[PDB]
Design a protein around this ligand. Structure first.
Ligand SMILES: [Ca+2]
Ligand SMILES: [Ca+2]
Ligand SMILES: [Ca+2]
Ligand SMILES: [Cl-]
Ligand code: NA
Ligand code: NA
Ligand code: NA
Ligand code: NA
Ligand code: NA
Ligand code: NA
Ligand code: NA
Ligand code: NA
Length: 473
């Protein structure tokens, strides 16, 4: 009975539907009757062309604001260079109108779509906070790709107002179920960037997404890190297709690219999922992504099986999003138990790093206490250390179940002598593992240089629950 969209560029949207099996399985969701009706998504970027012929029908002024000029109208600023086209491109990925003879379609082509104009000006902590915190009882899902420069030498994350916006969002947003913040993991591949150094994507409050090329490879621009959860398709080399969407000046583009094109596709899939079950919490949604995402046919040299039998990669997280599987699993999903937090201060004395430092600690994970965790979600190693050349460091963390997470890869351009100041390196790779037992932190100098420094604090922070586990995969 389901008739797929007739839009002129829909056949070019290879990632939505293909006979190849190299797609996001979105048609299967549409055929189950989920197209995003009733869900509200906001693009946090450089504005949205609200009168675009493929956006106007789904546009929601209630999901929109202009923080740069402080007015309700997120219309992009037009220039000869068309610099402010990115938000419009991303909006079309989520919610371009279907069956209207214009361009292609959004993943959630019946969802409502808005945009916050907030990148076209000075992006302060306050600007970020007011964008993240926009109308949080109306907007369900936020999509963003901003954060620290992808130069492979920066370490930065949300300051106080923005971090407060994240906690207010997931705590009180969406009727207490929590705002869904979908994030792109970064575009710094060429600079050998490592995305746990980006505190926005490295946050537990953001659902972080990386890219795969059409032929199933890790694109040139990709950043690997343990905080990433999953993957959607985006651009690659010049023989591979790219993302097809709405463009500035009421046009259509077939050349939208980069990890920033992956996050909106994920946001669209999450919109379909929320339509299938409006009662899903922000943590429920991350569980669904972990359980349903698919490694198959994604090529990486670092695929590893974790303690509960799931394949995970630092390039891809748990793999490609599967919209059909997401909406199926959502429908009778049982809400996860309240989030517990177990704080373990590991060191009894500072430790010289030298050539290599290994710190082993056996933990009980708050045994006997209300924060006892037997079922991990996110884990953080919050590290404070000095070092003379930061980018020469590589840091790994091994769970009791033997899952080795890369917290930090060598960053050749990072010459900083500033070290890390309580930086909360996060891994998703031990999700659903029992965190009781021996954890191992490894810090090593990857260079030949005689480097030096000291680890002064290592807090292992465990999040999760103590109930509801599945039989391991
Ligand atoms: Ca405006
Ligand atoms: Ca269309
Ligand atoms: Ca980065
Ligand atoms: Cl917390
Ligand atoms: Na900042
Ligand atoms: Na900072
Ligand atoms: Na900052
Ligand atoms: Na809540
Ligand atoms: Na994240
Ligand atoms: Na393993
Ligand atoms: Na154990
Ligand atoms: Na052991």
């Amino acid at each position: 009975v389901y008739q797929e969209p007739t839009d002129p560029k829909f056949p070019q949207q290879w990632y939505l539907s293909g006979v190849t099996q190299r797609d996001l399985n979105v048609k299967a969701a549409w055929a189950q009757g989920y197209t995003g009706h009733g869900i509200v998504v906001s693009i946090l970027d450089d504005g949205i062309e609200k009168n675009h012929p493929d956006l106007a029908g789904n546009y929601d002024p209630g999901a929109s604001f202009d923080v740069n000029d402080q007015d309700p109208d997120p219309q992009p600023r037009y220039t000869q260079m068309n610099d402010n086209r990115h938000g419009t491109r991303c909006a079309g990925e989520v919610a371009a109108v279907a069956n209207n003879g214009v361009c292609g379609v959004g993943v959630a082509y019946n969802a409502r779509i808005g945009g916050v104009r907030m990148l076209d000006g000075e992006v302060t902590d306050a600007v970020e906070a007011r964008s993240l915190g926009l109308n949080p009882n109306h907007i369900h899902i936020y999509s963003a790709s901003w954060g620290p420069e992808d130069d492979g030498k920066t370490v930065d994350g949300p300051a106080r107002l923005a971090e407060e916006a994240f906690f207010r969002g997931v705590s009180q947003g969406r009727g207490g179920l929590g705002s869904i913040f979908v994030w792109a993991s970064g575009n710094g591949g060429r600079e050998h960037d490592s995305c746990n150094c980006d505190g926005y994507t490295n946050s537990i409050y953001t659902l972080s997404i990386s890219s795969a090329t059409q032929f199933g490879n890790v694109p040139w621009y990709s950043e690997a890190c343990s905080s990433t959860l999953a993957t959607t398709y985006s651009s690659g080399n010049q023989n591979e297709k790219q993302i097809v969407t709405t463009d500035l000046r009421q046009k259509c583009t077939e050349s939208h690219t980069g990890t920033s094109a992956s996050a909106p596709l994920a946001a669209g899939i999450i919109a379909l999922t929320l339509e299938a079950n409006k009662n899903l919490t922000w943590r429920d949604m991350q569980h669904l992504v972990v359980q349903t995402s698919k490694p198959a046919h994604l090529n990486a040299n670092d695929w590893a099986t974790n303690g509960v039998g799931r394949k995970v990669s630092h390039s891809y997280g748990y793999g490609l999003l599967d919209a059909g599987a997401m909406v199926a699993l959502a429908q009778n999903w049982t809400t996860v138990a309240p989030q517990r937090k177990c704080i373990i201060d590991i060191l009894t004395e500072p430790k010289d790093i030298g050539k290599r430092l290994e710190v082993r600690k056996t933990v009980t994970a708050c045994l006997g206490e209300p924060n006892h965790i037997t079922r991990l979600e996110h884990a953080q190693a919050r590290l404070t250390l000095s070092y003379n050349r930061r980018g020469d460091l590589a840091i790994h963390l091994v769970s009791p179940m033997g899952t080795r997470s890369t917290l930090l890869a060598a960053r050749p351009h990072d010459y900083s002598a500033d070290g890390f100041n309580d930086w909360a390196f996060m891994t998703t790779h031990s999700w659903d593992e029992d965190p009781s037992g021996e954890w191992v932190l490894e810090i090593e100098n990857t260079s030949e240089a005689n480097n030096y420094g000291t680890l002064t604090k290592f807090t292992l922070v465990l999040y999760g629950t103590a109930s509801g586990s599945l039989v391991p995969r």
